[PDB]
Amino acid sequence: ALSLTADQMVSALLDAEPPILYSEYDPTRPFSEASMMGLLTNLADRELVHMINWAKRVPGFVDLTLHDQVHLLESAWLEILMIGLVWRSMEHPGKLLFAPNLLLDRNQGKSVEGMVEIFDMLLATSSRFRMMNLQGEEFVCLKSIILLNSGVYTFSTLKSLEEKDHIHRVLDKITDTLIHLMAKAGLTLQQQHQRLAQLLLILSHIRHMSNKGMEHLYSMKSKNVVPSYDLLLEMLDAHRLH
Amino acid sequence: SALSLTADQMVSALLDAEPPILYSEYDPTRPFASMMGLLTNLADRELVHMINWAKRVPGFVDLTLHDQVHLLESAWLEILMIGLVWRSMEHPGKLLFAPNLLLDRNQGKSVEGMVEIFDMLLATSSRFRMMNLQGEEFVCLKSIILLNSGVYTFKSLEEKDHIHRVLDKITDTLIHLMAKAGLTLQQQHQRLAQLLLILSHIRHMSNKGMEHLYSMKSKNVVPSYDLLLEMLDA
Ligand SMILES: O=C(c1ccc(OCCN2CCCCC2)cc1)c1c(-c2ccc(O)cc2)sc2cc(O)ccc12
Ligand SMILES: O=C(c1ccc(OCCN2CCCCC2)cc1)c1c(-c2ccc(O)cc2)sc2cc(O)ccc12
């Protein structure tokens, strides 16, 4: 993994991209605002399975222990859902494209108590992507950075010092990769550094939205909010029988 | 105008703007639970010095008062935390809230819900330590937190463009520092990225800290709009 070129890094990330899923309901029937959370929950749950298989294709990720793979996904899963949402919504001002058949605006967000504030933050992030003219190759680098970065500070065993050093090396490679993309695009050295910072600073906002969103989901008092250790392990820990 | 400062002038302005290190307010002859009262009192006194510092960050006072207040509302606990982490850098295993208030994680356990965030703060300090973070870099990072934390949640696009122009100059300033220190272009990029990724962790800690503070049902957690505006002293 640490021997990939920038071009190989981009290529592997582009190839790992998960599909765009649809909301599960009959589109010949009228839409009901009262079904919204149900629809969003079912969508998130199905997306999680594809997220696990995307994560396994992120260079350097399966080199980690399964325990650490689980912890990174525990920390990052809602951030990853959210940056994916923002990316899908970038070309639809004022809207959030949860699915091609589930395109919502903030007035619809208002029907769920406590949701509109987060809605508004997601919309502003989509606006920022648009203002920056964020490219696909840049987007997949950012999403991989979220996966590797978000949980790396909340995990001192010898094996684990080895894990953190590996993560930091892979992160350095993704930085090189972003710079390569920007250079190949024709940006000056000054413009490369400035845009690199602009991209990375957005990740602080994505982390903020993830924490506000998590607090919001917990406030709904559903039985199931986060993916369990066991659920994630089961999905991550495949046998070699297939 | 602020946008015309050189990288060297930006660094000097930020170093000179640095706030003082305050002490905890307690009688050291008296027996030492009341931990939260001490920390609350400390943070409350730190805030006015934070406002004086923000007014000295180049470009900040070119914003409307309304927008200055919004930025401080968003950033104040992050700023207190990166300050704590910086002060704690040479004290492995402990958090230097003040020179007369140096606590370890065992003392953090005495307050329900605190030790998890305590541990995150200690880890961030260790990361700064291992990166050999310099004072010149620290004051750039802290200025970035002030300008960046609220910029995605706001004439208004003129204000945002201004903020992003100032952020760009601080990026330029960070790179300049690293170049003078003899880092290669590759190392310059990589170090900039490593520093900015730590800011996501600091945002995370601020979020969890805020939840914790709210979970204690205290008199009040966030500084009000009116308090901040008053301290800005129009
Ligand atoms: O609405 C959701 C959402 C709903 C349920 C979720 O989790 C359901 C619990 N489930 C339990 C098993 C493990 C996986 C999660 C997650 C997101 C989405 C979001 C959200 C927005 C605002 C807010 O205040 C809270 C969340 S963002 C998002 C992106 C998606 O691709 C899908 C759903 C979503
Ligand atoms: O303990 C505090 C703290 C206590 C009270 C605070 O706010 C009190 C409310 N006050 C109201 C008027 C405006 C200012 C805030 C803020 C921080 C500090 C921190 C903390 C750590 C862990 C955790 O779970 C929660 C907080 S971090 C910190 C750094 C400081 O320089 C000072 C206090 C602190």
Residue numbers in the entry:
A (entry chain A): 307 to 461, 464 to 550
B (entry chain B): 306 to 337, 340 to 461, 467 to 546
Can you list sentences taken from the study reporting this PDB entry?
The pro-oncogenic cellular activities of estrogen receptor alpha (ERα) drive breast cancer pathogenesis. Ligand-dependent transcriptional activities depend on the association of coactivator proteins with ERα to form functional complexes. SERMs and SERDs elicit a structural rearrangement of the ERα LBD to sterically preclude binding of coactivators in the activating function-2 cleft. Activating somatic mutations near ERα helix 12, Y537S and D538G, enable hormone therapy resistance in metastatic ER +breast cancers.
We also solved structures with the WT LBD for those molecules with no existing structures (LA-Deg, LA-Stab, RU39411) or were able to solve to improved resolution (RAL). (A) Superposition of each monomer in the asymmetric unit of WT (green) or Y537S (cyan) ERα LBD in complex with RAL. Interestingly, RAL, which showed weak SERD-like activity in WT but not mutant ERα in our cellular lifetime and accumulation assays, also induced low levels of SUMOylation in the WT but not the Y537S cells. For WT cells: GDC0927, RAL, and OP1074 showed the most potent transcriptional inhibition at IC50 = 0.03 ± 0.08, 0.11 ± 0.08, and 0.14 ± 0.05 nM respectively, compared to 0.35 ± 0.06 nM for fulvestrant. Overall, these structures present canonical ERα LBD homodimers with 2–4 monomers in the asymmetric unit.
